[PDB]
Amino acid sequence: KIFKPEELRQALMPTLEALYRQDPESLPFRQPVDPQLLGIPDYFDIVKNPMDLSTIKRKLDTGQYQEPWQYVDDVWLMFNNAWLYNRKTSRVYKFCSKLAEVFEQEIDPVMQSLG
């Protein structure tokens, strides 16, 4: 099933905007992880394929998604990376769970409406 870029942007962007409006929980996800700046030099030993909101947003704006599951996969990639790297008790881990909750609620209706 193939979709047009503007169609996916209009359908999917509101679910991404919903993640951005979570404060302070979106803040760890707004730009790409920068290991040197963050003092976490082992980041890419654990995480092989980085992902973040700014990257997902660019892909939606530049027509790089053809099918809604490609977008959903990037969103889950971002969350799975943060769950993998960070300890269960850390502030980033919990912020991640909060965003994933918000995502699960926002994405389901949109996915049913697309078919």
Residues of this chain that bind ligand GHF (CB under 6 A): 24, 27-31, 33, 37-38, 40, 82, 85-86, 91-92
Peptide bond into 5 cis (omega under 30): no
Nearer of residues 10 and 31 to ligand GHF, judged by Cβ? 31
Nearer of residues 8 and 75 to ligand GHF, judged by Cβ? 75
Residue 20 interacts with which of a copy of itself, ligand GHF, none, CB < 5 to 8 Å by class:
a copy of itself
Q: Which of 51, 43, 31 is nearest to 86 (CA)?
A: 43
| Cα angle: 6, vertex 103, 8; to 5 degrees | 10
Site membership for a copy of itself, residue 20 (CB under 8 A): yes
